[PDB]
Design a protein around this ligand. Structure first.
Ligand SMILES: NC(=O)c1cccc(N)c1
Lengths: 190, 197
């Protein structure tokens, strides 16, 4: 449904390799090279997953209504191993597969570039650029299974995400499916 | 939002007490009493949760497209403790908080075909006033297989295509008595039955 997606022959899922030197590739490469200029990019792919996008956009609309502002989305990074890539492309990020038991996303590509996250393949590494509905956030802590409530006497009204540091966040954790949309996959080497 | 819901003015959540003798109440009562005739219903509430409904209906439409038929949905029961009711009413069922079943077919949220299963004190734990609580739930069971205790998602239909998954798992494919779901917004809590011995 986004305007910049290309035609999919009436299908619902496609990975589209970006053309180097065009505006879309350049924009994503720049976000990566801001902190990972010593790495070599092999390719960048746009993830066109209609079902995942639809469920994510429903959640975004709901969060925009609940927070009655539209500053709920951030573009973050997520490094993972090659064996998780097919699952993420098709199903997104699953907390069931410390600041809480959720899925973690980094502000800086350099954080996700650590081998503990983007585990090397032939030494190929994989990192997603992710639209994340961080919404209203608070500091996380170990053992959380959802974000904390905003106020005790209303324990069901929750923060949207948690972070390591509210003033200068470097990571965010989300605890529900469809709060994160994998937008691009970067394949790269050290 | 469904046309039979009460108008919520500009609200996104409401519980609606049903009246006995109407078909909506009586049919839920009949489904419950089919296996829970020793218990007595205090009340039945319709759960009107706009956001949960929207996200669930999106998943249902997607599953109906994927499976190329239209019986992916079952009406099942879920007994729980009073302390979980506010959360479920607002946020639905969360696999990360789910109880461990006495016979585990995976790490997910469990739903019963028969109210008698959910009526056990192990699940619908009596509160300090003797009230037990059971949800009636639209569940997207889709295509299913027999589960296994280690599962954190449904298994693949084919081991050589690991991402093409069953929609849910069960205890027994020939005579299913319980279903386990592993994703958010795959189950919509539609009614809450409050009942007693
Ligand atoms: N890239 C990751 O998987 C990641 C991002 C932020 C924090 C953590 N722990 C991991």
């Amino acid at each position: 449904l986004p305007e910049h997606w290309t035609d999919m022959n009436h299908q619902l899922f496609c990975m589209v390799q970006l053309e180097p030197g065009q505006s879309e590739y350049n924009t994503i490469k720049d976000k990566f090279t801001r902190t990972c200029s010593s790495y070599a990019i092999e390719k960048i792919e746009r993830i066109q997953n209609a079902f995942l996008w639809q469920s994510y956009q429903v959640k975004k609309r709901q969060m925009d209504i609940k927070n009655d502002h539209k500053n709920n989305e951030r573009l973050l990074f997520h490094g993972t191993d090659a064996d998780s890539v097919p699952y993420v492309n098709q199903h997104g990020f699953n907390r069931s597969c410390s600041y809480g038991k959720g899925t973690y996303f980094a502000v800086d590509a350099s954080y996700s570039a650590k081998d503990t996250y983007s585990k090397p393949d032939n030494g190929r590494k994989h990192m997603y650029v992710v639209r994340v509905l961080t919404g209203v956030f608070t500091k996380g802590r170990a053992g959380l299974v959802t974000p904390p409530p905003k106020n005790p006497h209303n324990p069901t009204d929750l923060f949207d995400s948690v972070t390591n540091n509210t003033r200068s966040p470097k990571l965010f954790v989300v605890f529900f499916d469809n709060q994160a949309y994998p937008e691009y996959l970067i394949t790269f080497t050290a």
